Amino acid sequence: ATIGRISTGSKSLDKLLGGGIETQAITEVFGEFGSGKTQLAHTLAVMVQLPPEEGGLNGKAMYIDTENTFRPERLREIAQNRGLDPDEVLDNVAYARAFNSNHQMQLLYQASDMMVESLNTDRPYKLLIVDSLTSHFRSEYIGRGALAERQQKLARFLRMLHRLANEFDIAVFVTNQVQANGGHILAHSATLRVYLRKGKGGKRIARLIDAPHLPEGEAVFSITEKGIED
Ligand SMILES: [Cl-]
């Protein structure tokens, strides 16, 4: 299947990403608390629903939340300010709370179920958000004696996400709270990594790092009544 791209709402960020976030891939935004990761996720959940000419993939979204970050009223606001029917937009975002790391992995079976049900419809799933990828793994596997198991369980979760991305031709977008002001996670991955931070004058700065097929660079964007914009 053709690799599809979902607009972020920011022309500059889309340019940095080679046109938008990709289907058949896991995009991982990382950065400090307050860097805009959840705002980007919410905006993508709306943008995916739009036609291609408007930055979407005529799709629906599923949003897995681990730290009570999902805000339906924020989706409604983004939808309304983009000229859409907020009730319709909300109906196209399937919410699931993950209570712990084992449940978080269980929810991928539910995701898979929903994706096959919608597959040959005029509105298939095109986006799975996991906000956040790592929080329950970090809270449940603490200290040296649990580190190996944390890594194995997270690796298994990421493998399952890649399977969903590739089997159902969806974009997977995950968030990760990290403090690395150099903008690099040491651990190697098969995610497309974007480092987010606060910039000057209310803006956010995204830095694309370690992509095989896109050059490293930065883009500036704002958080607004429309979600993310330049
Ligand atoms: Cl990976």
CATH code: domain of residue 11? 3.40.50.300
Cβ partners under 8 Å of residue 50, min gap 6: 7, 56, 58
CA of 225 to the centre of ligand 1 (A): 33
Q: 62-84 burial string, b = 16+ CB within 10 Å, else e?
A: bbbbbbebbeeebbbbbbeebeb
User: Obtained via which technique?
Assistant: X-ray
Query: Is 217 annotated as ligand-binding?
Result: no
Query: Is 221 annotated as ligand-binding?
Result: no
Answer positive or negative: Cα dihedral of 129, 168, 11, 95.
negative
Q: Bridge partners of 5?
A: 22
CA of 23 to the centre of ligand 1 (A): 14
Type and span of the H or E element at 156? helix 144-168
Q: Which domain holds residue 205?
A: 1-230
Residues 86 and 151: beta-carbon distance below 8 Å: no
Type and span of the H or E element at 153? helix 144-168
Question: How many independent structural domains does the chain possess?
Answer: 1
**Which parts of 17-157 are beta strand (E)?**
21-22, 25-31, 60-65, 93-97, 125-131
The pocket of ion ligand 1, defined by CB under 5 A, consists of 158, 189-191
Q: Bridge partners of 42?
A: none
CA distance 209 to 206: 10
- Nearest CA among 131, 124, 130, 117 for reference residue 56: 124
Query: Is 38 annotated as ligand-binding?
Result: yes
CA of 191 to the centre of ligand 1 (A): 5
